[PDB]
């Protein structure tokens, strides 16, 4: 006999949805029945997602590949509570439920691609991984010719896991304690791998390999290739001795930049900051000679200074911080700023100014 199983819709649905997230067989899921378990695997040849579903009902071992989006859409479209029977009939997979029948094309399991050497392993809460990624994801490059910038650095150091992302105009770094003594390792996860890892974080075990990373979450296993290349060292990017410290409420500062942005140049998005004793003035103008001005009370006792920024990059940081008060650490008008939560040093943001 060939592969056969019967499974409740609600046992199949979420696993199918997650693995279903080019070439014909790469649009298929590998389905394998073995030892009381249905395994479902999806891949794009660089990363892979595997789900395991316990089989409560009688089944027969075997394997096939079947179109992933069609099979998911069929199962989702069946009524709540439906039992779904699957068997193989020649070159098709027959799906039956109630008086519904679906015959899907298959390709042989033996033709489905398969990937491994592990080097560091640790466990951490899903919320911690999510914080690390959300703190830095927005600063990754998009289609930069420097391929290693299109992803995210994951680094272990001491008892901490760290993420770094940069596109050359801004950088984000976030570190969190893991409570385990870790070897030093730093790998680049491609953008699409970062996105897939986030989709799973609904503890987590991570294995970092030579050329791949693997995440175990519940009954799922995700694997991604790593990016070659030398990622920038964030320690060299942080401003060395930023002597001028401004503190402001995060909501009020963000709201002010967001209003000023309305009258900034649509292409270049430049705003001007004038810092003076306990005061920040933000101005914007555009080619139509329209002008915005915002004045805010802040905590600041340094020299007066004027510095320009792409307001989108500033708003991106303030939206990622989600805190009560922010600290901006300045040096001069042609040097980057460091921005951080006034109450936490777990994340830091570096933004290059524009020339005025």
């Amino acid at each position: 006999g060939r592969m056969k199983f019967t499974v409740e819709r609600e046992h199949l649905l979420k696993p199918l949805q997650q693995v279903s997230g080019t070439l014909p067989i790469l649009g298929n899921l590998l389905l394998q029945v073995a030892d009381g378990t249905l395994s479902l695997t999806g891949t794009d040849l660089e990363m892979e997602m595997v789900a395991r579903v316990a089989l409560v009902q009688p089944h027969e071992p075997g394997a096939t590949t079947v179109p992933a989006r069609k099979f998911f859409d069929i199962c989702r479209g069946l009524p709540e509570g439906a039992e779904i029977a699957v068997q193989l009939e020649g070159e098709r997979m027959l799906v039956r439920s109630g008086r519904s029948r679906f015959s899907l094309s298959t390709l042989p399991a033996a033709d489905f691609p398969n990937l491994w050497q592990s080097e560091v392993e640790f466990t951490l809460p899903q919320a911690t991984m999510k914080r690390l990624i959300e703190a830095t994801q927005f600063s990754m490059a998009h289609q930069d010719v420097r391929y290693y910038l299109n992803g995210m650095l994951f680094e272990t150091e001491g008892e901490e896991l760290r993420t770094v992302a940069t596109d050359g105009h801004r950088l984000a770094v976030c570190s969190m304690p893991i409570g385990q003594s870790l070897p030093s390792h730093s790998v680049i996860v491609p953008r699409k791998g970062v996105i897939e890892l986030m989709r799973m974080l609904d503890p987590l075990r991570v294995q970092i390999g030579s050329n791949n990373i693997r995440a175990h979450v519940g009954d799922f296993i995700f694997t991604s290739k790593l990016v070659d290349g030398r990622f920038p060292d964030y320690r060299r990017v942080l401003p060395k001795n930023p002597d001028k410290h401004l503190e402001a409420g995060c909501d009020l500062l963000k709201q002010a930049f967001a209003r000023a942005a309305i009258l900034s140049n649509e292409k270049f998005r430049g705003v001007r900051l004038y810092v003076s004793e306990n005061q920040l003035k933000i101005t914007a103008n555009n080619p139509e000679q329209e002008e915005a001005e915002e004045i805010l009370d802040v905590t600041y006792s340094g020299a007066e200074m004027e510095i320009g920024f792409n307001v989108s990059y500033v708003l991106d940081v303030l939206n990622a911080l989600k805190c009560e008060n922010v600290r901006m650490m300045l040096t001069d008008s042609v040097s980057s700023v460091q921005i951080e939560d006034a109450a936490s040093q777990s994340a830091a943001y570096v933004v290059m100014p524009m020339r005025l």
């Binding site: 940069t166 050359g168 920038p232 990017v237 042609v334 570096v350 100014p353 020339r355």
Partner: peptide
Amino acid sequence: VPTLPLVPXG
């Protein structure tokens, strides 16, 4: 539009 001091590319 200066860049951060990334090596290479700034």
